[PDB]
Amino acid sequence: GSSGSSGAEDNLGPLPENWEMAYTENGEVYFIDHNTKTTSWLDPRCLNKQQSGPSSG
């Protein structure tokens, strides 16, 4: 029953070189992950465990 989302720093740093943040035609901001060639709605820097293996969301 791990407590709610908790465990982030105040200085993550500028996105890596294997990523590209862009907005769709409509205007939806997304993050392009080349390292794995995957697309996400949220930012990786915030996440701890990158998209490893099969991920529903």
Curated annotation (Swiss-Prot):
It is found in: Cell junction, Tight junction; Cell membrane. The chain holds residues 295 to 338 of 1491 of the full protein. Plays a role in coupling actin fibers to cell junctions in endothelial cells, via its interaction with AMOTL2 and CDH5. May regulate acid-induced ASIC3 currents by modulating its expression at the cell surface. Widely expressed with the exception of skeletal muscle. Isoform 1, isoform 2 and isoform 6 are highly expressed in colon, kidney, lung, liver, and pancreas. Isoform 5 is predominantly expressed in brain and heart. Isoform 3 and isoform 4 are highly expressed in pancreas and brain. Residues 13-46 form the WW domain. Part of a complex composed of AMOTL2, MAGI1 and CDH5, within the complex AMOTL2 acts as a scaffold protein for the interaction of MAGI1 with CDH5. The complex is required for coupling actin fibers to cell junctions in endothelial cells. Interacts through its WW 2 domain with SYNPO and through its PDZ 5 domain with ACTN4. Interacts with cytoplasmic domain of ADGRB1. Interacts via its WW domains with DRPLA. Interacts with ESAM, LRP2 and CXADR. May interact with CTNNB1. Interacts through its PDZ 1 domain with NET1. Interacts with ASIC3 and AMOT. Interacts with FCHSD2. This is Membrane-associated guanylate kinase, WW and PDZ domain-containing protein 1. It comes from Homo sapiens. It comes from the Eukaryota.
